[PDB]
Amino acid sequence: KVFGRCELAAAMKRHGLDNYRGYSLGNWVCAAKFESNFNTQATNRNTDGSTDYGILQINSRWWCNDGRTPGSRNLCNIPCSALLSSDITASVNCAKKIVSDGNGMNAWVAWRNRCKGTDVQAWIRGCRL
């Protein structure tokens, strides 16, 4: 599913991501924009052999099981395919664990490089929330 911007903002809010770990909703929408362009089916293979999955490009080395990332963990206790669903619940639940791991949203390199420090409220501007 390719979410609209405000559609995704609303879904993220409903699932408790707004202000989670102190990160306002616009931070999460911005991260999803630059990780996946709001496409739940996004995947990307990394040089290390891990793969990133879903709207927030959650990586198989630590967070989900894909059966093809040797030596990896599955800290969200989920198949990586669950992160590709039109239903964002699994991605939200796993993102909550990731952002709680110590480095906040810097876990998402694209958030650090493209969202952090910017006017992230623009990502929710105009949305009925």
Token duo for residue 31: 């991260």
How many of the chain's residues bind Na ion (CB under 5 A)?
2
CA dihedral 124, 125, 127, 129 (to 10 degrees): 60
CA dist., res. 126 & res. 121, Å (int): 10
Tell whether residue 39 is a contact of Na ion (CB under 5 A). no
Q: Quick check: is 7 catalytic?
A: no
Element (H, E) at 10: helix 5-14
Q: Is 35 a catalytic residue?
A: yes
Q: Which of 3, 5, 8, 57 binds Cl ion (CB under 5 A)?
A: 5
Is 44 among the residues that bind Na ion (CB under 5 A)? yes
Q: Which amino acid is at 73?
A: R
Q: Is 43 in the site for Na ion (CB under 5 A)?
A: yes
Q: Show binding-site residues for substrate.
A: 101
| Residues at the interface with Cl ion (CB under 5 A) | 5, 24, 26, 67, 69, 72, 104, 120-121
